[PDB]
């Protein structure tokens, strides 16, 4: 699988306020490992209306650096009969 | 909501050997309503890694001649980290 990097981030979405950025490689999602968008994507599913936090830990393009990142989840999705979880959070992944 | 139509479904798919063809509209997937192909995924997500029958219930493309097709589960990707559940059915959505 592809690997999971972010190519945009929209601005003002809950990923720009959560610090994540073009570039980062996701790792794991509420501590649980992920190598594609499809595993990032079953992750977020199980959080669809919820409020807490998602928990989404990044490295950065060509480091070892890895960090963090609390997306804020305020009844996130909910309602919604045909969610689009990762563009929810303002990410586009990067496809070349 | 992009009403979910069948693009196209690959031959000696599972959703080719349950009988569905391009053309036709899903209306609710294991009892359940759907409204697009968003909600669609939401649905076959519930059944990853299971055996017995997924439930695809379809309207005919130009008519109101609804069936019932049972697409047959086999251990259905099971232990796979990032599924495309709709793809690993043969399936291509129809896209405007």
């Given at each position: 699988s592809?690997?999971?990097?972010?190519?945009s981030?929209?601005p003002?979405?809950?990923?720009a306020?959560a610090?994540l950025?073009?570039?980062?490689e996701?790792?794991?999602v509420d501590?649980?490992?992920?190598?594609?968008?499809?595993?990032?994507?079953?992750?977020?599913?199980?959080?669809?209306?919820?409020?807490?936090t998602?928990?989404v830990?990044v490295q950065?393009?060509?480091?070892?650096?890895?960090?963090?990142?609390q997306?804020?989840?305020?009844?996130?999705?909910?309602?919604?009969?045909?969610?689009?979880?990762?563009a929810?959070?303002?990410?586009?992944?990067?496809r070349?």
């Open positions: 592809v690997r999971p990097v972010i190519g981030v929209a003002e979405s809950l990923a306020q610090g950025e073009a570039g980062q996701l790792l794991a501590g649980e490992p992920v190598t594609g968008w499809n595993g990032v994507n079953l992750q977020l599913v199980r959080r669809l209306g919820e409020s807490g998602l928990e830990r950065e393009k060509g480091s070892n650096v890895d960090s963090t990142h997306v804020r989840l305020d009844g996130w999705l909910k309602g919604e009969d045909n969610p689009d979880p990762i929810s959070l303002g990410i586009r992944p990067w070349p």
